[model samples]
Target: MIRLGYPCENLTLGATTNRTLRLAHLTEERVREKAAENLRDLERILRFNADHGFALFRIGQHLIPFASHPLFPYDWEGAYEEELARLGALARAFGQRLSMHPGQYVNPGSPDPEVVERSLAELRYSARLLSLIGAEDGVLVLHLGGAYGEKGKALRRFVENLRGEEEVLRYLALENDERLWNVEEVLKAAEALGVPVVVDTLHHALNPGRLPLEEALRLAFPTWRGRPRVHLASQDPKKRPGAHAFRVTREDWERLLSALPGPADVMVEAKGKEQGL
Candidate 1:
């Protein structure tokens, strides 16, 4: 009930942020070294999460350099499956709810076939990593792609494309965005595609939907066929409306939790990551 969490890269863990070496510095040996390092640091992060009673986490997108890009040279997954499995078992042992959100670049409903293809590739890559570690239940959050003039066409394309791509559909969960689509629009798409919806409190604040916050949560809860998680963050007033703040304040949690009032875990999307809690 109302478990707290943070996104990838806990700064307090010192070196948990997985970064890629410069292009020129890249080598097969170097890639292997960095990949191993990423896995180990992730394992350490998971342990740290359990110790602190954080139950949900969204792993960073690029744990391995060029992982979903064509430039990646070798089979990183095959080489690291054993390590992945071990780390996965450790996460499940702690009963952590794992997740991965590919960057904004991943637009599944893009009109461009190439863009959609690349997005599918990234989703597949993430799904493989989750499965290798027996974290199949880890939800992969995506968004409704561009409104693209005709909102109906965009939603239809998303549903059709997703139906064909079963690989990315099973672990999928769609989220409401501040700009393009709000909670109700996302729920309609989820109903059409047979997927879940992740409610981001910050987005709702910026983009006021017709439904009240409590009603929105009620509508969204049932979309989650498996375990569900909510996204929570406060806007950084100094920055743009959609910008996330360095930390989540108690006031923010009181309001968010009061609206949702359920046992679903929360993934805190603050700049401070776990330390913010």
Candidate 2:
């Protein structure tokens, strides 16, 4: 059975990233309050996904603002350890496959050492969240950042960054993007880091990377140790080339799934979220 699911925040849920706080109003107490609320909502979203036959889900970023930022004050993992465990237990009980995709700002391969430092901190924050929930099978998806004039040098920098980040690096999976890193480049980076590669089908379509869709699919799965999760999305016709559609269509699903050889966890990335499922 294909375990198909969507990212966080369902259309019907009325709220996903509902716990928004302004920078000026920030406080340790307020951060705790918002995090608790967000976690509870996450639990709700997971339950909602399971109820609809989706066994995989991606959690959104900034559940706790400045969660990785040095300026923020609070041990979120420590503050909500109990609830995190509770949510993790709930997800495990339902046999949910979990993952997280941080914002574009997470650039571990940056030439600037300071940017790499901040990237590692954000990764640590993500690691803490997954750890709290006891999500042993959780994956962290990220692009390889910019090519930075020299693709070779930028890649080496990413590998060096991964060396110091072994703790969080083990859970990391490199994803193919439309703009910069394609399947081949990400595969090379994955080989260097000894990490799995996640093939974003839409990205591949937009940026062919000189590999046919079939070949790319065949190459990506083996990079993963076990069953790898595939990212599926429909392109927005009226919008920019790489933009994800607001909703996924049957033809879209059929065409994308037709390329796969076997059952795999599919992360639907349409803007409709659970409704996209």
Candidate 3:
């Protein structure tokens, strides 16, 4: 039984959990108010997912705006602990799996110290959010950032940087990218980091590694200590090679489901959001 889900938004509900205030207008009061709104909508989305039979869902990173920014001053976790606990209880009661994906700007492998520091901060925020919501088993998916003209060195740097991030490591998972790292490379990184690899069908189609779909699944699934998570996206015919369609096609869905070796959660990365499911 393949459990399918979508990332972040639910188009039908017309509600979002990523509401934020601009940095210029940032204030403790505004941040608190906005965060409250996001959490309220998040509960609504989780309830919608439960009623709709979506066992897996990805939480947006902006659930708490500027959460990792140095200028933002607030003990957000302490402030909203009760709401987070309530949301977690709701999710647990419904047997829902939650996750969060940091934005592309988060790259722990960067040569720049500032970038690396910022990335680590963002990762810590992610792990804390998941823990606060009692979704400790949920994974934090990330990509092997830019190769920096030296793929091997960059990957090594990424591993080195994440060496002592105990909090982040507990939930970190690597994902294959379209141009830089393929499933095989991500698997290697995951093995080195002791994390799971999230194989993306669209990325594989765009930049297939040495292994075929079935072989990739066989290798990737074992890396996951818990139920494996994979990403499925239909290619947009008119767009660029790696562009995702508004909705996943039956052919694409069949192709992935047929390749799966066992039951796993599939996150639909499409423009249609929950409507894609």
Best by TM-score: 3
- By lDDT, the best candidate is 3
True lDDT of residue 147, candidate 1: 76
Q: In candidate 3, how many clashes are counted? A: 0
Error of 2 at 24 (Å): 1.1
Report the C-alpha displacement of residue 147, candidate 3, in angstroms: 0.6
Please list the C-alpha lDDT of all candidates, in the order they appear: 0.83, 0.82, 0.89
lDDT of 2 by residue, 1-277 (tens): 4788887677887657445678795778888778777777788888887787888888877677678887878667677788788888989999998899977778888988898899889898887778888888889999888887998898898888777776577578889988988999899988988888888888988888799877888888887777777888988989998788888878877866788766678898998887764
Of 2 and 3, the candidate ahead on TM-score is: 3
Instruction: Report the candidate with higher lDDT, 2 versus 3.
Output: 3
| Residue range 1-277, candidate 1, lDDT tens digits | 6788887787877756356778694778988787777777898889998888888887777787678878788988888888888988888999988888888788878899999989888888988877787887788898787877988898888888777877677788999988988999999888887889999988987886797778888889887766567889988979988899998888888877788746787889998887775
Off by over 4 Å in 2: none
Compute the lDDT of residue 153 as modeled in candidate 3: 95
Clashes of each: 0, 0, 0
Error of 1 at 240 (Å): 0.5
lDDT of 1: 0.83
